[PDB]
Design a protein around this ligand. Structure first.
Ligand SMILES: Cc1cc2nc3c(=O)[nH]c(=O)nc-3n(C[C@H](O)[C@H](O)[C@H](O)COP(=O)(O)O)c2cc1C
Ligand SMILES: Cc1cc2nc3c(=O)[nH]c(=O)nc-3n(C[C@H](O)[C@H](O)[C@H](O)COP(=O)(O)O)c2cc1C
Lengths: 106, 105
């Protein structure tokens, strides 16, 4: 099952909601992640160029898909097939971002 | 500011998250909507054909926009500029739905 993260649009995109599969994949409970930017999932082997592409896409409110190395709460690495999209109103204002995570390690 | 509703994908699409503006627009607090289908926002003068279009789009996980008459918690009608989209993983599985409201009354 794939994870889902909703963040606010502004203010460095704090997490406002996660689904159950996010906890299954990452080992973090909702309490441990609400109000934080999702970059705590990254670590030393995460590819910096991938991170840069995410950073630029989010700043532009452009959809993006990447495979990125992430880390569970206990430190276990896993490969995350990550898809992020803005949520827009009909006037084009960005209301939120949504991200979907799939553990593709295996 | 526009409202946002996130629902589960299956069963009857219960609400799992709303933003602040949802409460501003609708008058409902998060606690009183979580776990319910969003159709409680409809009422006597809501257009049935519009509801049916939403129903079919959600069943097929198709994006849709409608201007629909809804009712605040206090019973006051308002026009909701509603857009719904599915949230999918890369295999195409539907993870959730997202709806965005704009009060255009
Ligand atoms: C909705 C959403 C979900 C995200 N999910 C993840 C994720 O699962 N894993 C990850 O490494 N980064 C995720 N990010 C990306 C980071 O939050 C951050 O945007 C990225 O690392 C780029 O910024 P930075 O260089 O400021 O860290 C997500 C971002 C958003 C907006
Ligand atoms: C994410 C999402 C948000 C929705 N938001 C609204 C809304 O703001 N107002 C509304 O009248 N219906 C909304 N709906 C539609 C109803 O929940 C329901 O799908 C619709 O009335 C058709 O179904 P029915 O004939 O079974 O009621 C939303 C549905 C979803 C999945």
């Amino acid at each position: 099952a794939s994870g889902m993260i909703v963040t606010d649009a502004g203010a460095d995109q704090p997490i406002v909601f996660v689904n159950r599969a996010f906890s299954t994949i990452t080992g973090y409970a909702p309490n441990e992640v609400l109000g934080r930017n999702a970059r705590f999932l990254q670590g030393p082997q995460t590819d910096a160029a991938t991170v840069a592409r995410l950073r630029e896409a989010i700043a532009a409110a452009r959809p993006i898909q990447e495979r990125i190395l992430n880390y569970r709460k206990d430190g276990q690495p896993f490969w995350n097939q990550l898809s992020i999209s803005p949520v827009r109103d009909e006037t084009g204002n960005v209301v939120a971002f949504v991200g979907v995570q799939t553990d593709v390690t295996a």
